[PDB]
Amino acid sequence: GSHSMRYFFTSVSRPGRGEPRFIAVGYVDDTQFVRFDSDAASQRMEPRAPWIEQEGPEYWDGETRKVKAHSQTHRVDLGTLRGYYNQSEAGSHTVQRMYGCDVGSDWRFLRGYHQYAYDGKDYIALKEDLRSWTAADMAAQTTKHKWEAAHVAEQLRAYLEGTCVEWLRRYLENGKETLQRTDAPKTHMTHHAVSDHEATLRCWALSFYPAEITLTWQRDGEDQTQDTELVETRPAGDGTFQKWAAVVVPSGQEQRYTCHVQHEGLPKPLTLRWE
Template sequence: MELSLLSLFMLGVVALTQTRAGSHSMRYFHTAMSRPELGDSQFITVGYVDDQQFVRFDSSSESQRMEPRAAWMDKMDEEEPNYWEEQTQIYRKNAQIYRRNLETLRGYYNQSQGGLHTIQRMIGCEVSAEGSLRKGFYQFAYDGHDYIALHTETLSWTAADTGAENTKRKWEPEKSIAESYKAYLEKECTHWLKKYLVMGKDVLLRTDPPSARVTRHRGPDGEVSLRCRAHGFYPAEISLMWLRDGEEQLQDTEFIETRPGGDGTFQKWAAVAMAPGQEDRYSCRVQHEALAQPLSLRWEPEASSLWVIVGVTAGVLVLVTAVVAGAVILRRRNSGGKGGAYVPAADKDSAQGSDVSLTATGEAPGALELEGG
């Protein structure tokens, strides 16, 4: 598989920033964890539209209900009166299915009773600025390793190891399983993503320009580095590039991944090392969709107010652009043990007991038992 689900779940929101500007995504992350000390398991689901978490379910919570995680989801009672009750019932059932799937996968990998194990699933879609489907995602992991994924073009399953082959042998002959998920990704997922974008447009379609500055740092051995830091921007996709004498400088450059700022915006920095006295040869270029043009920043020893000046300037540039163009810039962006996951079962008995249709409220076709064929 191209991207490890472990990375997706560890990075959370950050993993959702890898899409092109103008596109939008909706993804659900499901995690089931065994709790041997309690003789039980915990099941958690979080849903994201772009970088914003909008729903959450936790089987260990007092209410065991699907709950809103974005203010704009409070409108859902008016849009879909039965939404929250339907989602709650769906995920309570899924929690039971995942509990059984943990036992199934423990058997696949000859793991002894007890021990901490996890099943993870990521499902979702990404649409272009025009609203057409760009790609769909349907992947599973077990104990932090890839397990199995759906290839929507060929309606085939990619198994990561011999354990996952058990599931592949069960699902692949039953073409209706892959077909139902493909149909969900192409129709239901995109439909609900567009609906959520309309409901949360004030948050999801906004653009906040970055404030940025360059600082100088000296290491214990006298080495010098310049750090270019941007913060307060939305959406999360941004480019920071160091240039030396106008040429892109990748060597001796250190980047950190874009990170949530804690207030609904994001932050990022890039640092470059150099010999002392060379600082004036370097500039940092900052590109973001909320900027009318890239920012070019240099280290200025006495410019203590640069942070504020750059932020104000960026805001003015965006305002001027909006007035001249008469349009709002739309935003976007995308995402131990062996592999394992929960998925649709093909046998008649298990399908009868656990095929929960979720398409009415934007989730995928039902969670089925993970049994080998």
């Protein structure tokens, strides 16, 4: 079972309303475990899953210290970029940052990431080799030269390949029951007459973890990709996920159609058929 650790950082300027908004959230695979909100009263990194609540005050005091340092860099960054693009001080702008690491089924480093966007577009990203940078424009090229001269990539590499994966492993061990579990999908199908010569067949997958899943319809064993309505995998609210797939079936043809479900929590892919 491959795993990842990821932090997502959102910074938004609020012209004439004071300091910019800053949200930090941390995830292990598809489970959120911490948060920081600039507008909340605690002004601290806060637990968002029971298993991390067992870390003591040194852990929390340290994460709070580092999350405040991130916020402060993002506060200076909004003004730097604004100057780089010669932008007015009246418009609201958006900065986003994402970093983390993935490990494979052996729990060993597979890849590390550090990406950065300005107003929803790629601004600067660390390449896969963890030594070079991908700059989206001249403003970005200016950030690149700065980060190159301060040896930022080398510092990131030591974090993503070392510390990042070490703490991922610690987290996987500590939140074993939550994070090392798989919840196979609970499946069912519904049939709803739409008219008198056709009907909607819906295939459901519920209460599954993790979120990755393949849910497809076939007619005589042939893919119906183009003829399927497929919703985006959505969160149930309790740590599990849901998804459905539907097709409009001509009268008397229910038996030509099969619903296919692939998921980590299933020992063998399921083949369902209304009958």
